Amino acid sequence: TGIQISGKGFMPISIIEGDQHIKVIAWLPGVNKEDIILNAVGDTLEIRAKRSPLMITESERIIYSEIPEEEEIYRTIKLPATVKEENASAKFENGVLSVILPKAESSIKKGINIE
Amino acid sequence: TGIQISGKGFMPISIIEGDQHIKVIAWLPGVNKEDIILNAVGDTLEIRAKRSPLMITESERIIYSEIPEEEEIYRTIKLPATVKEENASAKFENGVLSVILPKAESSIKKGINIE
Amino acid sequence: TGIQISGKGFMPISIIEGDQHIKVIAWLPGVNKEDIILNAVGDTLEIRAKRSPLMITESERIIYSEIPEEEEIYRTIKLPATVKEENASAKFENGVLSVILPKAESSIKKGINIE
Amino acid sequence: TGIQISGKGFMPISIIEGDQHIKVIAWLPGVNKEDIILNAVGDTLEIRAKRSPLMITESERIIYSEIPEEEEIYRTIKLPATVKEENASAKFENGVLSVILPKAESSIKKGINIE
Amino acid sequence: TGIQISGKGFMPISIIEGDQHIKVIAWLPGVNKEDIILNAVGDTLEIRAKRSPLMITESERIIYSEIPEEEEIYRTIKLPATVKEENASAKFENGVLSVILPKAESSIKKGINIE
Amino acid sequence: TGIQISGKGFMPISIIEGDQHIKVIAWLPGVNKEDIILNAVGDTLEIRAKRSPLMITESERIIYSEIPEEEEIYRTIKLPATVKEENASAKFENGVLSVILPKAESSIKKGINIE
Amino acid sequence: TGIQISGKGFMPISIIEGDQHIKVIAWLPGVNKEDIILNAVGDTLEIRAKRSPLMITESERIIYSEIPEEEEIYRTIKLPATVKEENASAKFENGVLSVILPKAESSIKKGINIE
Amino acid sequence: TGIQISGKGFMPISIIEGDQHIKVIAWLPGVNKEDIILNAVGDTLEIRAKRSPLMITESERIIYSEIPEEEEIYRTIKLPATVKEENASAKFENGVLSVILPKAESSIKKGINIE
Amino acid sequence: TGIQISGKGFMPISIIEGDQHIKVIAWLPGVNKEDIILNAVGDTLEIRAKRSPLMITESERIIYSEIPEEEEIYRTIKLPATVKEENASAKFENGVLSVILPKAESSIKKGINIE
Amino acid sequence: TGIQISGKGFMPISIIEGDQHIKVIAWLPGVNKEDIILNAVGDTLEIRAKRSPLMITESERIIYSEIPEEEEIYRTIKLPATVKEENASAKFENGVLSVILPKAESSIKKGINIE
Amino acid sequence: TGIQISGKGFMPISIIEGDQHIKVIAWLPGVNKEDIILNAVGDTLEIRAKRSPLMITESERIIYSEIPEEEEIYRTIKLPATVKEENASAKFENGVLSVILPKAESSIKKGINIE
Amino acid sequence: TGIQISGKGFMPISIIEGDQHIKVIAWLPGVNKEDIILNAVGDTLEIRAKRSPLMITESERIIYSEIPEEEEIYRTIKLPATVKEENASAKFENGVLSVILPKAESSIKKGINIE
Amino acid sequence: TGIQISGKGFMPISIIEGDQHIKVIAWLPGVNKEDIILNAVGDTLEIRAKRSPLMITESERIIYSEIPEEEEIYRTIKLPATVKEENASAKFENGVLSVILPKAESSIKKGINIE
Amino acid sequence: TGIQISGKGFMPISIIEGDQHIKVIAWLPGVNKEDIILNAVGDTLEIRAKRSPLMITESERIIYSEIPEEEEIYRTIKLPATVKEENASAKFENGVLSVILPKAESSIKKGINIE
Amino acid sequence: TGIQISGKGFMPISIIEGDQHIKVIAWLPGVNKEDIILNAVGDTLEIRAKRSPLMITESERIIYSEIPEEEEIYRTIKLPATVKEENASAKFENGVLSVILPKAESSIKKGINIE
Amino acid sequence: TGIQISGKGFMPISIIEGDQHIKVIAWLPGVNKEDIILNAVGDTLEIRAKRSPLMITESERIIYSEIPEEEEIYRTIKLPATVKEENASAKFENGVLSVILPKAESSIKKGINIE
């Protein structure tokens, strides 16, 4: 549907497009700020992250779990437009990752009169 | 299977039992530290929480998303054994919740080494 | 579903639990002020009521009817928590009964600090 | 069966035909006096009403309810005979509406007796 | 059999259609000459009758009965074609009614005038 | 579909609408002027016909034939609007029947404008 | 079956063979005499025709038809025996075509004596 | 509903009804004000119109289209109530048609007050 | 098929190509001239629109509709060639949108001689 | 098998093919010389006959019978090669018909040498 | 279907039938004028042709194709009529083959007058 | 496919045509030159043969055998053209039979020049 | 399969790609020299043509045709590499269309040393 | 899934990406070093090879084989990034091909800060 | 088929058989000579080996593969003839393995030369 | 599967084959070291033992038990190859038996000359 996505593991994401930039939304619970790698260029975006396994005491044991445990996970997406990555910015809080990607000049759409 | 869990929406949770305590783990992405209500007595656990919606500018618009949008979500659990909630504790970081539940000394089993 | 309900006839009912009280609703069309029996104890609730049959003039005849004709009906309910029925209150209007059940101090959940 | 009924939502109704009139019964739980609209002409009758769902207070946690809650509801009925609407009458108490309409055909009362 | 007959009580009827009229034979045992109400309009016919009440008593221990005293009995017949009610005629003998419905002039089917 | 047709035998037909009339067409292969029946009233039409069977000489024998053998054929049709059958006309040539049905003025729907 | 038929369009036909000739029957609703071209040689017959389409008025519209639309139609049939086309004859009436085919002398059956 | 709809081709429709009138909504994309034929009488509606096909130059060609090409299209409607066609009005804008149908005096229903 | 389309809601569209320009065809019933936003660049065409809700008087109600009720709708198209947006023009009438996009020289085809 | 046999009734037959002629055998028990009709031309043959029923005196009764009762019987046969029916010779004796038919010159097969 | 067609390979063909002749149309793409062998007699036509394989350069490999490859191709057709080959003619250009077959006199059909 | 074959026994065959002749091929294993009979005329071919059974010694017995043992066998064929049998020649060696049939003058086709 | 082909109508095309150029091969039988339009740029190439219909005299008609009749046809293709149209060359004979595309500089692939 | 591969024959492959380059893996059994051609450019890479067929001795026979027989084979793959072919390197050992594609500058990804 | 093979792992194989020896072919991509385990005796042969997995640098990642990842593989074969295993020989070049098995003189078959 | 197993009682067993020996494992819960009988010869192995029953004290009484009570238990296993039982060994700990079966030296497979 105008975009392609790939990667390993589970990863909720969402994308918002403006007239000058694009906002990226991602869910990465249980990760330390340093465990994240995000690289981009042109119109392509890459997300890489690793989470610690849930340690347990020798006396302790798990009766039940829902959480997938695979530590390494990443997701790749092709955007609908080219961006100026060098000016991009991102915020991460509450296990959630936030990104801002300025649009490239060529991508800036233009209006047309209607009569 | 000896315990039951209930609630609305999508919410990962994990449960672990210790000799002196029981440990509960849950993922609360998009929840501010103060947005959480957590209540416990005896051997039953309850959780309620609200995550802000995805804000957008009139120019901006959502193109793709799998993340569910509903804000308020909750979870309820019945433990297998009684706990001393008065001494329990909870720690929440990076959109993930952990809770320490002291087992009742009456509930605390007596491992015997014999042969 | 964690609670049980039974009885005879059609008597739509809905239950709402509040931190300090429980609100319950029952559809009772066409029933007079004197026909209603209410009883609650511990964490269970009972209702019994009787509606006069459809009287008609000798020259009249019922050509069509979807309204059920039975007079007496009752319903049993298991509450999830104990209530202080002695201080409860209820009201009936427009064929519907409204109830408020104060919750016992023992049953009232305790909140725990988050850190 | 010589008479037709239609509308939306749940609305039990009873039709009673007299030698000089037709009486109609409608169950409208929780419906206020001013919210109900009654209209008729010829040999057809129509009903409109709307019910306010509820108000939230405190936690306001409700389990799977047995009571329906569609707000707007109406019903239309074709009578077997023409009625004199200008002389009709209606009353609503205990959540049930009662209506009596004199029959225009009865005001004519044709007869061509032969051997 | 493509035509509708309805009513209450036991009242055998035979409907005969002519090219200029409709003739109907009906069984009305025990009904007086003045007790038979006959009405017609458009393409429908109404037959109404009442027989002697023939009450019940005691000190007899009724030993046998096949004759019902049901007084008010009627039948509604959907005629296949329009009739001129003002010109109808009938004869009643030995509890059997012989009606004539002269639909002789209310329409005249087109004919062959081909050239 | 707003008009109904039935009958026995093979009889193709087609229907037309006119501003002040209705045209109807019927294929009647091998039918003589005298074998034909056409009657109509109101908004319904009837057709009956009978065609002589396949005659054969004593010295001849039918080695193959696909043409049906039945002689009598007929059709009945419900028209969509009222017609003034007294003014109708029809023509039959080359085994095909054409009929002209002037429409009832009351049935004519004209005289609405846009602004 | 010792004989073949082919062509396009709707064309009922029946064939009858005489000891000295062969007679053929054809259904041609709505065809003008000149519209048809019948030819023959050897033991095969060819029939060509064209039926005018259903002309219409500007205000007119066709609401339904059973009649097929195509105009140009023809059929071909291979006779089992040779004929003397120069002596053939045909008659067409009431949208129906008849043909008489004198059988060739060698085509005409010869009977061996009793012994 | 008591209403019927018919016609050919693609023509989206919606129908509103008023107490004193009836309002009709029709989509007619790609139409000029003069191409539309509408007429009304009694309690039934008809709408007929024509839209030009897609013009093109010999140096241009169709690569992809969803819009159906057939030009002549119409629809018909059977109302549940009679209207006063002579007083009806209609407006057309932005490819959409709005019609106002003053309801007949007999059609106008009588409201019934609750006693 | 070498061209990509996307958006939300119902939006008929068709596309035409010439040697020097691109023509765009779309259906927007019931929209006001200003309610539409269209931008494009490179080979990408964006269409955005918001439609008025079907106004209804309090006494009225929609007995039936086919028109989709959603108000805002938009579409995106990736053309097979590049365009000079700054020179484009568009006309809109009768609920239809017309847009002409001159092709970009670099993308503009060249004729190739054949010998 | 390159040839066809047809007819009615029990008529066993056998066919014998020579270099210069064809001989054919047919079982016709109980048929008179005057009852037989045989006709052949080209490379096909016809046989027609009739056998009288079994007579008995009125006092006599058939205690056992396997012999068939039907009288009229016939057969038709297609040869694989043309025959000169002029020179045909037939012999009927003991309820069996024998016939020899010289073959046509073209039918006559020339012996071909081996080198 | 009155004519037989056979042969190996791909060779589109169509047949035309003159009253004095027969014209045949065949597609023989990629063939040099001399590479066709054609011969015919009676009412049967034989066509033989061979094409060079689609040559390739030593440093050339085919990415994609659909054209069938077999070099020799032939077809045979049995006409419904006898012809005079000695007088025939044919043309071949633009990879398309044309042939003219004058009919035999016996092939000439004789028109039949109709009465 | 325009050619038909018949006979009894096992006899694989293949057929060859040239511009000047026809060549025929047959497998007749275990058959001596003297046991073969072949005949032909016009455009049809006959084959007849008989193979000596396998003799067996008294001390010897057949353990297993796939070979069909029927001695006499024959085949019949209809050629696609007429031949001149008086000049035929055939070879039989290595258990395989070959035949060369010079064409008839009508059989040899005449080339048609191209324009 | 990594390459795009498109267009309407019947147009066989086989594509071949050389290291230094692209050769394009297509079958366009039955078209005139000038009705061929081939244009290209970048990495995409277009083909348009029209073919005369099979004309006939009124005395003439058809027995059978395999050739499709539609007249306008075209095809478009996206090559794997960009070209320099200016040096393009093409030949068309015998209904076969040949085109040569010298490859663009940036497209010329470079061999890699092997170890 | 973002990468495309095509070709004919059997040739297992696998692909790897690095931050400076791309590594390619391929199985090529039975290939001498000389018969493999590798070329690539930009983001396009092609592999061509031909293997000697399995020669055999006159006395020899193939009883069973799994290996496919085709000799010429190739593959094409379009990479996710463009490379600097001139710097590439490819090691071939043990019937397996290894290739190194140093990434081009614009392909080089850029990391972006987070807070 | 009288010969069987078994084992785990992917290993295409083809058996060849001489008169004085037997040849066999095995595909073993990525198998170092030292990882090769092959053993046989009498008329049965064994094959076993392990392949190193594809290593990667931490920065590197697998995007797509077809390579089978199982390492340890082997095969077992029953040969149809005994061999002098002590006299066998093998060759392993470019990932393809070949072997020669001198056949035991007992297995060696003695030719028979008679007419 | 080349080996056979038999015996009585509950006895999980595992079999492992090496290059020069064969290893066998058996579960012997509750069996004393001396309770076992172990014998083997050629390529078959025998194991027999008797395990004591479940004793109970005077005051005791058995309420539940799953363990089978049968004392005598044995198993018979025919090995695939002959073994050097004279050199075999066995080891039994924690109720589980292990046995080493050095297989016959003659069974060794060797002889292939590795280049």
From Swiss-Prot, chains A, B, C, D, E, F, G, H, I, J, K, L, M, N, O, P:
Membership in a protein family: Belongs to the small heat shock protein (HSP20) family.
Q: Kindly state a single biological-process term from the GO annotations of this entry.
A: protein folding
Q: For this protein, what is any one GO molecular function term?
A: protein folding chaperone
Q: Name one GO cellular component term.
A: cytoplasm
Question: Which organism is this protein's natural source?
Answer: Methanocaldococcus jannaschii (strain ATCC 43067 / DSM 2661 / JAL-1 / JCM 10045 / NBRC 100440) (Methanococcus jannaschii)
What fragment of the full-length protein is this? 33 to 147 of 147
Subcellular localization, per the record? Cytoplasm
Q: Which residues form a coiled coil?
A: none
Could you identify this protein by its name? Small heat shock protein HSP16.5
Which keywords are on file for this protein? Answer: Chaperone, Cytoplasm, Stress response
Q: What does this protein do?
A: Chaperone that confers thermal protection to other proteins.
Its organism's taxonomic lineage begins at: Archaea, Methanobacteriati, Methanobacteriota, Methanomada group, Methanococci
Domain named sHSP: residues: 4-115
The record's note on quaternary structure and interaction partners says: Homooligomer of 24 subunits. Forms a spherical shape.
Broad class of the protein's primary localization: cytoplasm
